[PDB]
Amino acid sequence: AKGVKKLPKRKGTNPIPRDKWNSDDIARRQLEQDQKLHLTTKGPHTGTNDSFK
Amino acid sequence: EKVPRIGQFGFEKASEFGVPESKRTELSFYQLAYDFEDYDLAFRYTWKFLRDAPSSQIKAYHNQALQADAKLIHRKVMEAIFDNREREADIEGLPYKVYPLYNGDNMIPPEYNGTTFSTGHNHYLVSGGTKIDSADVEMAADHIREHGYTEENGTQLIAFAHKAEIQEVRRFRFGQTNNNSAVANYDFVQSQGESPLYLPNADGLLGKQPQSMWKGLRVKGSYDDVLWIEEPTMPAGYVLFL
Amino acid sequence: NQGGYNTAGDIKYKTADGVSYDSLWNLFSNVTDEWNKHKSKMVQLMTFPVTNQTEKVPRIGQFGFEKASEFGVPESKRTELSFYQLAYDFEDYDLAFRYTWKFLRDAPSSQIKAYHNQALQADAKLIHRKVMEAIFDNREREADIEGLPYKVYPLYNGDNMIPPEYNGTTFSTGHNHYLVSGGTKIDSADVEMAADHIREHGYTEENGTQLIAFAHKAEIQEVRRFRFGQTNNNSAVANYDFVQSQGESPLYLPNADGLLGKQPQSMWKGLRVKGSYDDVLWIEEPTMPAGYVLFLATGGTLAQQNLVGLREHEDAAWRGLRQIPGNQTRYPLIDSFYQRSFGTGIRQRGGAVVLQIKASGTYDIPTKWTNGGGFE
């Protein structure tokens, strides 16, 4: 067979290029773990409010 | 709110006579609150009116009360977003503070990917020009995406805008000048359901084509990765990015 | 770090606005950090378990013929054996938790589970640091094995050890694999030099080995710009193209219409490949300090085992992370210890190169991987 591969070219609309990285995938996977760091509470209905901003 | 992560340990080089140093950590958390209010309407009649009036008029007045409710709830949701002022509320006799978007106040947004914010962070932005440009759109979308909320995290951004601003945005083309001497870094791609358009160059459009609808609303197109929606409720000089 | 005994008064409520302090500590009771998972992956692809605490590399000399005579007899020929020894280091590491009796009375159970879990994280961080400074610390160490003092080596580092001869290439003393670029930004000239410093020792594509480069993204942002016959950074001209990996966006391809050959793979051992310059796969490494590149040979005949040996103890009762019962107990004070013991050395002293991007002067060890201080 021929040794040359034809490169792909820009179609009429072509997606925005965004660099994939390993450090960005670590940060992405960490954030979907950090998204479990919440507790359900009794809300403002406690006769105290000192945990509220 | 999201509980801030604990500190992390480290070992010490051992000895045959001594003992190591001790380790510890601590926690913290916080909460946010929501407003509440009461609203009411009246329907007063005379005994002659209820004797003589058609039942269709009474039923029309009832149907109009249900539509007065829809208008009230809509207004109160939209002014929660567009009114940039902090509100006090009393809940079970204690005071609380309830919030708009970041408004130049003393909350500091949490750090994300090693970028740390100051006090005075703000999401009520002025364009600095009589007509929208691509630097305004890119600035505003980046003000969201610096907090997380990025396309790699699987979000979609939406922009809701009035016709007078959409008709500027749909003219953004890569490397061309816009309003206020801004130069576009992307180009506006029409949704698949819009009026036909010739592609300007063999060097095709820098963006993916949007689908016809998002959430049952029709989409005009996309610039950057944000979808633009013609929103008839929107006031003229304003855009909501979400 | 916070330090000291845990005391009543380090506890601060049972509940606040209805949430319980035990539930807050229960969140952290079983977390694991994605950075410590990445560090554990890098150790797993960069080390091997030491079965043999020392290694020998023997050699012999050689001789030739001479012209005959009808009357005489030839001068006699002779040869001698010689060798080098290599060894692996070993060290002991320690950690404590200490409590007061009234802290243990009042504290939520989940706080102890969270402290235990963070000791496992600290163990993973320690092993990673000690593997990376085996590669980066540039200095030789002693190690007593059976009370005989052996010697533990980095890569080739300007020392009196002479690399084995290969393809008739004879090396001197003073061979070095801690390279300085001689320029503020990376050249194609620097990349080409560093890869050839490996490939002269064997570790060729002829021998079936694959070279990898691990780098901080700021160096990859230069290397991805290299194109054949074009000038790049410190007036260097590239002898090759940087070729994108098969998975990258087409928008980043140069102004060309064909590729002679094939694009490099997207993924290597679950790490993501940006592309290749020369035959070297370039991988963005989350842990790399900024001004540095590690070039590593892998696979084939000569690099069939990973660069760094981990020497754990001979007895299973002393292997792995262990808890020791402590020596303050019940009242008024309580303690316990975590203990880990291992050490690190390199056998294949030519199997990698470290390149530092700086303008002039000698190599600097990265502060985060200097052996003289820190354990994380």
XYZ file of C-alpha atoms in Angstrom:
671
model
C 0.000 0.000 0.000
C 0.943 3.739 -0.273
C 2.797 5.207 2.753
C 0.880 8.550 2.831
C -2.196 9.319 4.974
C -4.414 12.191 3.756
C -4.923 14.646 6.637
C -8.482 15.703 7.654
C -9.541 19.262 6.658
C -11.963 21.901 8.005
C -15.628 21.071 7.238
C -18.229 23.863 6.731
C -18.725 24.121 10.518
C -15.932 22.704 12.712
C -15.889 22.471 16.598
C -13.885 24.886 18.795
C -10.508 23.222 19.550
C -9.865 22.726 23.283
C -6.650 21.105 24.545
C -7.033 17.884 26.520
C -4.424 17.467 29.302
C -3.830 14.970 32.148
C -3.726 17.721 34.821
C -7.141 19.022 33.679
C -8.586 15.484 33.874
C -7.327 15.117 37.490
C -9.012 18.435 38.352
C -12.240 17.341 36.554
C -12.328 13.984 38.440
C -11.543 15.686 41.774
C -14.391 18.205 41.344
C -16.987 15.418 40.828
C -15.762 13.957 44.181
C -15.827 17.385 45.940
C -19.473 17.687 44.765
C -20.352 15.021 47.460
C -19.147 17.287 50.353
C -22.639 18.550 51.390
C -25.041 17.700 54.244
C -28.824 18.112 54.473
C -29.823 20.385 57.399
C -32.891 21.591 59.366
C -32.565 24.935 57.485
C -33.057 28.326 59.274
C -35.678 26.600 61.537
C -33.318 26.065 64.536
C -33.568 29.167 66.815
C -29.916 29.933 65.851
C -28.412 31.266 62.600
C -24.632 31.503 63.265
C -23.725 29.043 60.415
C -25.474 31.377 57.894
C -23.569 33.998 55.834
C -22.706 24.824 51.104
C -19.706 22.725 49.929
C -17.689 21.702 53.029
C -14.018 22.899 52.721
C -11.506 19.983 52.560
C -9.317 18.956 55.570
C -5.510 19.316 55.767
C -3.225 16.439 54.695
C -0.484 14.606 56.652
C 3.232 13.736 56.122
C 5.594 11.124 57.632
C 8.816 11.806 59.581
C 12.169 9.940 59.297
C 12.232 7.337 62.103
C 14.706 6.721 64.934
C 15.702 3.775 67.173
C 15.427 5.791 70.452
C 12.904 8.645 69.816
C 9.152 8.898 69.009
C 7.481 10.907 66.167
C 5.577 14.234 66.290
C 1.736 14.291 66.440
C -0.740 15.303 63.641
C -4.193 17.091 63.549
C -7.009 18.758 61.459
C -10.330 20.664 61.842
C -13.646 21.242 59.951
C -15.947 24.174 59.062
C -19.260 24.663 57.130
C -21.927 27.297 56.271
C -25.502 27.780 54.939
C -27.613 30.290 52.918
C -31.289 31.419 53.296
C -34.349 32.433 51.148
C -36.956 35.249 51.342
C -40.761 34.877 51.906
C -43.791 37.199 51.413
C -47.631 37.234 51.203
C -49.753 38.621 48.350
C -53.601 38.812 47.870
C -56.286 40.142 45.408
C -60.075 40.812 46.028
C -63.337 40.268 43.979
C -66.179 42.455 45.446
C -69.751 42.374 43.858
C -73.313 43.708 44.669
C -76.358 41.326 45.028
C -77.808 42.819 41.760
C -74.620 42.068 39.830
C -74.624 38.353 40.835
C -78.363 38.093 39.969
C -78.069 39.704 36.532
C -74.458 39.164 35.210
C -73.599 36.216 32.857
C -71.800 33.236 34.493
C -69.132 33.518 31.749
C -67.987 36.852 33.284
C -67.437 35.271 36.735
C -65.496 32.381 35.120
C -63.444 34.896 33.089
C -62.551 36.775 36.366
C -61.392 33.428 37.910
C -59.285 32.578 34.816
C -57.733 36.085 35.049
C -56.782 35.523 38.748
C -54.781 32.397 37.741
C -53.000 34.557 35.120
C -52.347 37.312 37.731
C -50.548 34.619 39.779
C -48.344 33.574 36.813
C -47.300 37.248 36.271
C -46.463 37.682 39.996
C -44.284 34.542 40.297
C -42.445 35.388 37.050
C -41.684 38.985 38.186
C -40.444 37.816 41.608
C -38.105 35.196 40.075
C -36.669 37.679 37.547
C -36.037 40.443 40.116
C -34.214 37.855 42.284
C -31.674 37.711 39.385
C -31.743 41.276 38.015
C -31.948 43.315 41.261
C -28.278 43.442 42.360
C -29.086 44.339 46.033
C -28.782 42.134 49.114
C -32.073 41.632 51.051
C -32.698 41.112 54.744
C -35.267 38.464 55.727
C -36.669 37.426 59.136
C -37.165 33.659 59.579
C -38.606 32.378 62.900
C -37.856 35.860 64.352
C -34.081 35.793 63.518
C -32.527 38.046 60.805
C -30.858 36.535 57.696
C -29.193 37.934 54.521
C -30.373 36.650 51.102
C -28.361 37.252 48.000
C -28.249 38.244 44.314
C -25.358 37.092 42.069
C -21.873 38.309 43.215
C -22.411 42.105 43.494
C -19.135 43.751 44.637
C -19.785 42.640 48.250
C -17.485 41.060 50.876
C -18.152 37.383 49.978
C -15.027 35.874 48.385
C -15.798 33.176 45.762
C -14.090 29.809 46.555
C -10.766 29.060 44.799
C -10.974 26.915 41.636
C -7.962 25.195 39.924
C -5.538 27.469 41.862
C -7.184 30.816 40.871
C -8.104 32.793 44.025
C -10.682 35.606 43.971
C -10.781 38.834 46.072
C -13.583 40.618 47.912
C -15.496 42.891 45.492
C -16.187 40.115 42.929
C -19.084 41.115 40.626
C -21.499 39.631 38.014
C -23.480 42.823 37.201
C -21.288 44.014 34.317
C -21.400 47.205 32.171
C -20.266 46.791 28.541
C -18.559 50.219 28.220
C -20.085 50.772 24.735
C -23.446 51.653 23.101
C -23.688 48.277 21.230
C -22.590 44.758 22.309
C -19.290 43.322 20.981
C -17.483 39.958 21.088
C -15.124 41.105 23.876
C -18.197 41.763 26.072
C -19.571 38.279 25.282
C -16.202 36.557 25.849
C -15.599 38.544 29.092
C -19.050 37.660 30.453
C -18.819 33.934 29.593
C -15.313 33.779 31.160
C -16.628 35.483 34.344
C -18.888 32.408 34.714
C -16.287 29.825 33.605
C -13.608 31.016 36.070
C -15.808 29.566 38.924
C -15.986 26.088 37.342
C -19.108 25.746 35.127
C -16.959 24.923 32.040
C -17.783 22.823 28.978
C -15.199 20.209 30.168
C -17.239 19.890 33.405
C -20.203 19.068 31.068
C -22.128 22.383 31.343
C -23.936 24.310 28.664
C -23.937 28.123 28.890
C -27.103 29.877 27.617
C -27.505 33.588 26.812
C -31.023 35.086 26.866
C -31.137 38.370 24.941
C -33.397 40.904 23.209
C -33.534 41.130 19.350
C -31.540 44.396 19.334
C -28.478 42.590 20.819
C -28.917 39.241 18.996
C -28.823 41.107 15.650
C -25.328 42.365 16.638
C -24.060 39.008 17.956
C -25.082 37.031 14.832
C -22.740 39.302 12.774
C -19.585 38.206 14.689
C -17.077 36.505 12.299
C -13.581 35.270 13.151
C -10.829 37.922 12.892
C -13.312 40.644 11.730
C -13.945 43.937 13.587
C -17.300 44.368 15.453
C -18.737 47.326 17.395
C -16.361 49.357 19.650
C -13.306 48.110 17.600
C -13.412 44.600 19.174
C -12.187 41.655 16.988
C -14.058 38.325 17.209
C -12.110 35.227 18.356
C -14.868 32.838 17.130
C -17.796 33.080 14.697
C -21.561 32.897 15.180
C -23.004 29.572 13.950
C -26.742 29.545 13.160
C -28.958 26.823 14.628
C -29.990 24.127 12.088
C -33.568 25.606 11.941
C -32.643 29.215 10.898
C -32.968 30.904 7.457
C -30.328 29.606 4.960
C -26.867 31.255 4.810
C -23.843 30.891 2.467
C -20.642 29.722 4.213
C -18.212 32.646 3.648
C -14.933 30.786 2.991
C -13.429 27.326 2.253
C -11.921 27.877 5.743
C -15.256 26.881 7.411
C -16.957 28.358 10.549
C -15.120 28.074 13.921
C -17.945 26.537 15.988
C -20.271 23.500 16.088
C -23.819 23.961 14.705
C -26.457 24.090 17.521
C -29.565 21.915 17.470
C -32.983 23.590 16.845
C -34.140 23.828 20.506
C -32.810 23.876 24.079
C -35.264 22.978 26.907
C -38.209 23.503 24.479
C -37.031 27.077 23.574
C -35.804 27.846 19.999
C -32.052 28.633 19.680
C -30.748 31.361 17.299
C -27.174 30.033 17.187
C -23.907 29.910 19.135
C -20.859 32.160 19.605
C -17.953 30.835 21.676
C -19.715 27.661 23.053
C -22.720 29.597 24.551
C -26.191 29.148 22.951
C -28.136 32.346 22.168
C -31.908 32.462 22.717
C -34.214 35.247 21.518
C -36.078 35.959 24.756
C -39.205 38.172 24.408
C -39.394 38.850 28.201
C -35.855 40.371 28.235
C -35.461 44.219 28.536
C -33.635 45.922 25.657
C -30.142 46.814 26.991
C -29.503 43.521 28.895
C -28.210 39.949 28.480
C -28.495 37.122 31.011
C -25.745 34.500 30.743
C -26.595 31.273 32.630
C 0.654 21.706 59.802
C -1.296 21.970 63.072
C 0.581 19.540 65.408
C 0.339 18.497 69.109
C -2.154 16.488 71.226
C -5.853 16.445 70.403
C -7.620 18.121 73.369
C -11.130 18.891 74.531
C -11.453 22.445 73.107
C -10.216 21.207 69.710
C -13.774 19.767 69.719
C -16.096 22.811 69.200
C -19.725 21.591 69.136
C -21.977 18.497 69.174
C -24.244 20.306 66.660
C -24.426 23.746 64.997
C -27.707 25.047 63.452
C -28.944 21.405 63.586
C -26.023 19.732 61.647
C -23.935 17.153 63.614
C -20.137 17.238 63.982
C -20.010 13.425 63.553
C -21.721 13.755 60.110
C -19.205 16.421 59.033
C -16.252 14.148 59.942
C -18.047 11.191 58.338
C -17.745 12.943 54.900
C -13.930 12.676 55.103
C -13.928 9.144 56.629
C -13.205 7.375 53.293
C -12.227 10.039 50.676
C -9.237 9.596 48.353
C -7.521 12.449 46.496
C -7.261 12.165 42.680
C -3.717 13.574 42.994
C -2.793 10.680 45.318
C -4.376 8.265 42.771
C -2.240 9.888 40.032
C 0.911 9.721 42.223
C 0.166 6.025 42.885
C -0.151 5.462 39.078
C 3.194 7.221 38.415
C 4.932 5.039 41.048
C 3.327 1.913 39.531
C 4.598 2.701 35.965
C 8.049 3.937 37.197
C 9.184 1.305 39.766
C 9.752 -2.432 40.271
C 9.907 -4.614 43.456
C 13.576 -5.359 44.320
C 14.211 -9.122 44.733
C 18.052 -8.773 44.622
C 19.555 -6.183 47.037
C 22.705 -5.792 44.836
C 23.613 -6.204 41.123
C 26.925 -6.842 39.234
C 27.914 -5.825 35.692
C 31.044 -7.815 34.696
C 33.241 -7.292 31.572
C 36.421 -8.784 30.030
C 39.153 -7.344 27.771
C 40.048 -8.552 24.224
C 43.068 -9.346 21.956
C 44.146 -9.814 18.273
C 46.465 -11.931 16.043
C 49.942 -11.052 14.663
C 51.864 -12.028 11.459
C 53.438 -15.512 11.422
C 57.096 -16.496 10.663
C 58.783 -19.691 9.347
C 61.110 -19.711 12.460
C 59.626 -17.645 15.361
C 56.688 -18.135 17.794
C 53.983 -15.520 18.614
C 53.754 -13.197 21.600
C 51.163 -14.535 24.074
C 47.687 -13.030 24.665
C 45.747 -12.651 27.968
C 42.564 -10.983 29.351
C 41.157 -9.881 32.762
C 37.659 -9.703 34.315
C 36.263 -6.551 36.031
C 32.855 -5.367 37.346
C 30.797 -2.652 39.062
C 28.308 -3.249 41.919
C 24.925 -1.450 42.163
C 22.671 -1.472 45.286
C 19.276 -0.218 46.563
C 18.876 2.097 49.613
C 16.580 1.456 52.651
C 15.009 3.776 55.275
C 12.388 3.861 58.101
C 9.540 6.417 58.389
C 7.169 7.208 61.269
C 3.989 9.200 62.192
C 1.938 9.739 65.442
C -1.560 10.592 66.591
C -1.888 11.687 70.250
C -5.016 12.308 72.349
C -6.058 13.374 75.851
C -8.458 11.051 77.750
C -11.230 13.701 77.656
C -10.742 14.271 73.910
C -11.440 10.523 73.396
C -14.501 10.799 75.715
C -16.083 13.680 73.739
C -14.733 13.383 70.138
C -16.926 11.929 67.329
C -15.843 8.425 66.177
C -15.659 9.611 62.535
C -12.786 12.018 63.402
C -10.506 9.033 64.201
C -11.524 7.282 60.935
C -10.752 10.494 59.007
C -7.283 10.741 60.712
C -6.586 7.061 59.839
C -7.600 7.681 56.211
C -5.266 10.721 55.964
C -2.368 8.502 57.194
C -2.940 6.256 54.112
C -2.812 9.400 51.920
C 0.473 10.481 53.611
C 1.953 7.008 52.891
C 1.124 7.287 49.150
C 2.669 10.820 49.046
C 5.879 9.627 50.788
C 6.515 6.708 48.396
C 5.953 8.999 45.384
C 8.379 11.712 46.623
C 11.085 9.114 47.390
C 10.703 7.533 43.927
C 10.944 10.911 42.150
C 14.006 12.107 44.094
C 15.732 8.791 43.236
C 15.593 10.070 39.600
C 16.042 13.832 40.204
C 18.401 14.184 43.255
C 21.589 13.808 41.084
C 23.731 12.540 44.069
C 25.162 9.178 45.122
C 24.191 7.443 48.437
C 25.666 4.654 50.614
C 23.655 1.578 51.669
C 24.839 -1.107 54.126
C 23.615 -4.590 53.059
C 24.703 -7.402 55.437
C 26.863 -4.638 57.017
C 28.952 -4.331 53.798
C 28.782 -0.670 52.586
C 27.467 -0.696 49.004
C 26.826 2.345 46.803
C 23.518 3.620 45.374
C 23.388 5.663 42.198
C 21.297 8.247 40.323
C 21.513 8.352 36.479
C 25.023 8.913 34.985
C 26.133 12.058 36.866
C 29.719 13.047 35.914
C 31.244 10.291 38.112
C 34.116 7.817 37.490
C 31.771 4.969 36.401
C 32.232 4.354 32.634
C 29.139 3.327 30.582
C 29.377 -0.063 28.763
C 30.684 0.248 25.169
C 27.974 -0.050 22.444
C 28.212 -0.264 18.589
C 31.996 0.356 18.975
C 31.248 3.671 20.792
C 33.651 3.943 23.746
C 32.584 6.306 26.532
C 34.914 8.185 28.926
C 34.602 8.809 32.653
C 32.382 11.818 33.453
C 29.284 10.654 31.502
C 26.274 12.803 32.461
C 22.457 12.594 32.151
C 21.619 15.709 34.213
C 21.677 18.090 31.247
C 21.304 21.897 31.097
C 19.749 23.405 27.940
C 21.959 26.537 27.765
C 18.884 28.654 26.827
C 15.752 30.162 28.476
C 13.306 28.189 26.214
C 13.513 24.606 24.869
C 15.099 24.018 21.432
C 14.645 21.127 19.067
C 18.450 20.972 19.521
C 17.956 20.251 23.256
C 15.317 17.552 22.620
C 17.495 15.896 19.949
C 20.583 15.955 22.244
C 18.656 14.482 25.201
C 17.078 11.596 23.228
C 20.438 10.707 21.604
C 22.120 10.671 25.054
C 19.753 7.767 25.876
C 19.937 5.964 22.488
C 23.762 5.767 22.443
C 23.578 3.219 25.375
C 21.282 0.797 23.565
C 17.637 1.793 24.274
C 17.118 2.237 20.509
C 14.015 1.683 18.399
C 16.164 -1.052 16.724
C 16.124 -2.783 20.174
C 12.302 -2.234 20.272
C 12.338 0.399 23.074
C 9.932 3.381 23.163
C 11.215 6.705 24.555
C 8.767 8.882 26.539
C 9.137 12.532 27.543
C 7.271 13.719 30.655
C 7.031 17.503 30.811
C 5.239 20.486 32.304
C 2.708 21.888 29.778
C 4.721 25.115 29.244
C 7.482 23.064 27.499
C 4.940 21.066 25.443
C 3.524 24.431 24.241
C 6.972 25.022 22.623
C 7.671 21.456 21.421
C 4.302 21.256 19.592
C 5.486 24.213 17.398
C 8.538 22.358 15.951
C 8.472 21.822 12.126
C 11.142 20.252 9.878
C 13.767 22.712 8.575
C 12.130 25.703 10.375
C 13.916 27.794 13.027
C 12.486 27.658 16.593
C 13.799 29.070 19.923
C 17.560 29.796 20.488
C 18.243 29.806 16.675
C 17.902 25.987 16.509
C 16.444 24.422 13.320
C 14.202 21.376 13.828
C 15.400 18.093 12.246
C 11.879 16.560 12.582
C 8.180 17.481 12.682
C 6.202 17.410 15.903
C 3.366 15.086 14.848
C 0.033 15.324 16.707
C -1.403 12.307 18.440
C -4.266 10.487 16.655
C -6.908 11.862 19.117
C -6.114 15.644 19.014
C -8.275 18.250 17.181
C -7.677 18.629 13.381
C -7.685 22.448 13.888
C -4.142 22.228 15.372
C -2.579 20.486 12.294
C -0.062 22.638 10.291
C -0.514 23.929 6.712
C 0.110 20.500 5.055
C -2.183 17.918 3.324
C -0.543 14.501 3.938
C 1.433 12.576 6.555
C 4.194 10.165 5.527
C 3.697 7.298 8.053
C 1.145 7.232 10.969
C 0.155 9.523 13.885
C 1.246 8.346 17.393
C -1.317 6.747 19.740
C -3.731 8.831 21.910
C -3.153 6.950 25.176
C -0.085 5.358 26.840
C -0.621 3.352 30.096
C -3.759 5.505 30.724
C -1.780 8.785 30.374
C -2.670 11.037 27.409
C -0.107 11.609 24.629
C 0.071 15.081 22.982
C 2.148 13.796 20.016
C 5.746 12.877 19.125
C 8.862 14.780 18.107
C 11.461 12.344 16.781
C 10.168 8.872 17.918
C 9.677 10.268 21.499
C 6.075 10.305 22.841
C 5.394 13.605 24.657
C 3.165 13.306 27.733
C 1.991 16.207 29.899
C 2.866 15.205 33.459
C 0.778 16.847 36.248
C 3.568 16.436 38.867
C 6.552 17.805 36.849
C 8.143 21.075 38.096
C 8.105 23.799 35.439
C 11.663 24.074 34.004
C 12.294 20.298 33.648
C 11.776 17.366 31.248
C 12.304 13.670 32.026
C 13.181 11.446 29.046
C 12.674 7.723 29.774
C 13.270 4.525 27.750
C 10.594 1.773 28.083
C 9.955 -1.753 26.684
C 12.138 -3.603 24.129
C 15.149 -5.795 25.025
C 17.056 -3.474 27.376
C 14.304 -1.496 29.271
C 11.959 -4.462 29.958
C 11.790 -3.450 33.699
C 11.060 0.032 35.130
C 13.736 2.560 36.167
C 13.596 2.642 40.026
C 13.827 -0.326 42.409
C 11.686 -0.276 45.586
C 13.508 -2.210 48.354
C 10.969 -3.267 50.998
C 12.153 -5.354 54.017
C 13.058 -9.085 53.786
C 10.391 -10.155 56.378
C 6.620 -9.932 55.667
C 6.042 -8.822 59.309
C 7.967 -5.585 58.432
C 6.626 -4.993 54.860
C 3.742 -2.601 54.104
C 2.333 0.282 56.182
C 1.949 -0.866 59.832
C 0.279 0.396 63.015
C 2.291 0.230 66.260
C 0.238 0.269 69.549
C 2.001 3.368 71.057
C 3.280 3.778 74.647
C 0.923 6.275 76.312
C -2.350 4.411 77.100
C -5.886 4.945 78.611
C -5.209 7.884 80.968
C -4.381 10.765 80.998
C -2.691 10.585 77.536
C -3.010 8.171 74.591
C -0.873 7.638 71.462
C -0.351 5.342 68.444
C 2.107 5.195 65.511
C 2.143 4.479 61.777
C 5.401 3.045 60.419
C 6.567 2.488 56.796
C 10.027 1.317 55.645
C 11.533 1.132 52.133
C 14.194 2.690 49.892
C 15.107 3.438 46.286
C 17.949 3.085 43.737
C 18.539 2.901 39.940
C 20.133 -0.023 38.008
C 19.745 1.260 34.400
C 21.845 4.478 34.896
C 21.555 5.281 31.139
C 17.801 4.474 30.780
C 16.699 8.095 31.361
C 17.872 11.733 31.014
C 16.814 14.819 32.983
C 16.936 18.095 31.026
C 16.679 21.467 32.805
C 15.690 24.569 30.792
C 17.941 27.374 32.110
C 20.261 29.878 30.420
C 23.652 28.840 31.959
C 25.409 27.047 34.875
C 25.126 23.587 36.513
C 22.003 21.440 37.019
C 19.722 22.297 39.993
C 17.777 19.587 41.859
C 14.024 20.526 42.041
C 13.189 21.804 45.570
C 10.118 19.487 45.820
C 12.403 16.450 45.127
C 15.588 17.428 47.015
C 16.469 14.468 49.313
C 17.791 16.713 52.155
C 14.338 17.785 53.498
C 10.550 17.263 53.351
C 8.486 14.032 53.173
C 5.682 15.090 50.751
